[PDB]
Design a binder for this molecule. Structure first.
Ligand code: GTB
Ligand code: GTB
Lengths: 209, 209
């Protein structure tokens, strides 16, 4: 710390790290970049991969949303208790990111013509996570183990935006449903989900959700 | 241990971990799954995400190539000397994974009509790595720190296949060129890169490269 988040005025790839920080009682500076400013072409070229979010831990400057989540999980005790749990949380996060990539393409490239096909293919993309919970204390604890990890925050965030995109996508996934309701109930999480910062912030940058 | 790689008869997303295991003097078993066997649909459903590669490390089974690479780095000491380097390495690997994703898209879904555009845009995608090396000991060591890490193996593999796709794409990147030659010169990698198993394995599933 101190933490600073440089990103567009949307939840997108910054919301999971925001929940994580919040749930851990951490504070951070918010450096919002409007599309207008972005198109000026002054910030983009100074970005490692020419993209946001950009993360600053004071001395360390980072890019790549998942790399940032992993850094936070590792430097905050949210990365499992051993090497086996760490490997599994990664396997989980990788799956979360694959689905997120598809979500983004849909939202920004073919919402109208693709949504119908997306929602229909969604169940087969959620099952792997339902299966992971069943194999872990009947799905009573977390995605991996019994302690909140950076992978949970990413998964939770991914499931929440999908419930918005398709209201009943978790109806056939008991474990995931309760899992979502539970984590959301967590004091600082529930509070984060109701804060104006979050509430007023659009999920995506094109007004689609 | 022991180590077992379950994947199609190609290098693709398994060559980097193989090269990694090779440079560490480690041996492993290969369970080659053919296209005809995969089409039977017996194995696919047993995969967490319905895809390969599948990795077995003793009683630990893993899916997702980058999760597998991270597991090996952590367990074999190829994940930096501290948190700062670990975060930096994930930032690199994620970058490598974004370009790999685009590479696969070109190869499998738009090779003939998109290659020109891809190669023309490639310099912009390689610049970040050149930059990363110049900021680390002037670029005489590795991608992050003074010790080889899982990120190097993934980047090295990606760079090698891009030289096959676009001969001389590293001509305008002195650090990245010398980097490849340097790492490819490592005795164990030098041997792997010329080993029959590696050589006899096509780069991708459709023969295009
Ligand atoms: N792998 C990278 C992917 C980053 C990425 O896609 N970044 C987008 C923003 S998230 C998606 C997004 C797009 C637009 C808005 N907006 O408000 O206009 C918000 C979010 C970006 O920087 N785009 C700028 C560019 O490439 O030039 C990661 O995980 O961090
Ligand atoms: N994010 C996952 C992506 C995995 C992936 O794309 N897997 C492909 C194989 S690598 C790309 C590939 C495709 C085809 C061949 N082939 O020989 O026919 C080889 C490699 C797959 O399992 N496809 C089967 C399916 O989805 O049903 C990861 O990083 O591991």
């Amino acid at each position: 710390p101190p933490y600073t988040i440089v990103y567009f005025p949307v939840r997108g790839r910054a919301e999971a790290m925001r929940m994580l920080l919040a749930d851990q009682g951490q504070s951070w500076k918010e450096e919002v970049v409007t599309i207008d400013t972005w198109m000026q072409g002054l910030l983009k070229p100074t970005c490692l991969y020419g993209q946001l979010p950009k993360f600053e831990d004071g001395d360390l400057t980072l890019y790549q949303s998942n790399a940032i989540l992993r850094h936070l999980g590792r430097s905050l005790g949210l990365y499992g208790k051993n090497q086996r749990e760490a490997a599994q949380m990664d396997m989980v996060n990788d799956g979360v990111e694959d689905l997120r990539g598809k979500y983004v393409t849909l939202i920004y490239t073919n919402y109208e013509n693709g949504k119908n096909d997306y929602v229909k293919a969604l169940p087969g993309h959620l099952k792997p996570f339902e299966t992971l919970l069943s194999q872990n204390q009947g799905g009573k604890a977390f995605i991996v183990g019994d302690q909140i990890s950076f992978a949970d925050y990413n998964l939770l965030d991914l499931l929440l935006i999908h419930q918005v995109l398709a209201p009943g996508c978790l109806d056939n996934f008991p474990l995931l449903s309760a899992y979502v309701a539970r984590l959301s109930a967590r004091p600082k999480i529930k509070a984060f989900l109701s804060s104006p910062e979050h509430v007023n912030r659009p999920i995506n940058g094109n007004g689609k959700q």
